[PDB]
Design a binder for this molecule. Structure first.
Ligand SMILES: NC(=O)C1=CN([C@@H]2O[C@H](COP(=O)(O)OP(=O)(O)OC[C@H]3O[C@@H](n4cnc5c(N)ncnc54)[C@H](OP(=O)(O)O)[C@@H]3O)[C@@H](O)[C@H]2O)C=CC1
Ligand SMILES: CC(C)c1ccc(N(C)c2cnc3nc(N)nc(N)c3c2)cc1
Length: 206
């Protein structure tokens, strides 16, 4: 009663795998954040009485969220840290690993609990994304590719869009992205702040 859901990773990255700078995001793309919130919050209409998605994030990512914005609303948040702890929040869940977070979640939101888990997302940062990529239950990446080599200081840890990984990681058709996300999703390049980005979905067989 532990390995019955697959994990999905969601990330916005440049073409050089850049994800962050100065402990935040090195762009401010309101439509991209709005895509993030929709994908991570979407629960099919039949289920959205009692079901919620989960966002799993590293301690530095938790600290990068503006104070007045965390925990991230309408999702079950869990912060991963090896220091139990001082953290903070709000009744905020924490765990010392991805698997400890899963155990915590299945124990807390058990078959009887009023709130039920729908999908579980890993939402960053690089260190946690590294652990997610090694996890046997991770099978899907929702990537926003940012077509600009923006200066970054933190990078996505595995070059999953590169030739060396292309027998393992496959890019899905846009209709399949829409069907998974449950809504119409812009197709191809969007321009905001004078650079182009686009939404992709990649999968790995379990
Ligand atoms: N999509 C995007 O573009 C995203 C970008 N970001 C960016 O990423 C940067 C944050 O990345 P990063 O510095 O790698 O930080 P993380 O958010 O991965 O925080 C790392 C910390 O979280 C804990 N942690 C992470 N992985 C594990 C693990 N497997 N087991 C136990 N503890 C773990 C540790 O906490 P402790 O030290 O407490 O033990 C570690 O010090 C920021 O710039 C942020 O803006 C973040 C999310 C999305
Ligand atoms: C605007 C506030 C609520 C906010 C601040 C930071 C973030 N982060 C960490 C963030 C922001 N955008 C993101 N975009 C994608 N595609 N994927 C991610 N994992 C991602 C993560 C999200 C929301």
């Amino acid at each position: 009663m532990n390995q019955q859901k697959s994990l999905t990773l969601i990330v916005a990255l440049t073409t050089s795998y850049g994800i962050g700078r100065s402990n935040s995001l090195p762009w401010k793309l309101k439509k991209e954040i709005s895509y993030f919130k929709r994908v991570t919050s979407f629960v099919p209409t039949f289920d959205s009485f009692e079901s919620m998605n989960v966002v799993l994030m590293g301690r530095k990512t938790w600290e990068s969220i503006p104070l007045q914005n965390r925990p991230l609303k309408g999702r079950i948040n869990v912060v991963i840290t090896r220091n139990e702890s001082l953290d903070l929040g709000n009744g905020i869940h924490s765990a010392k690993s991805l698997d400890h977070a899963l155990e915590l979640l299945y124990r807390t939101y058990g078959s009887e609990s009023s709130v039920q888990i729908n999908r579980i997302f890993v939402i960053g940062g690089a260190q946690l994304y590294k652990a997610a990529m090694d996890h046997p239950k991770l099978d899907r990446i929702m990537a926003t590719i940012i077509y600009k080599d923006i200066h970054c200081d933190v990078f996505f840890p595995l070059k999953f869009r590169d030739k060396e990984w292309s027998s393992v990681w496959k890019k899905e058709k846009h209709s399949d992205l829409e069907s998974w996300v449950g809504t119409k999703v812009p197709h191809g390049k969007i321009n905001e702040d004078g650079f182009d980005y686009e939404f992709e979905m990649w999968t790995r067989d379990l």
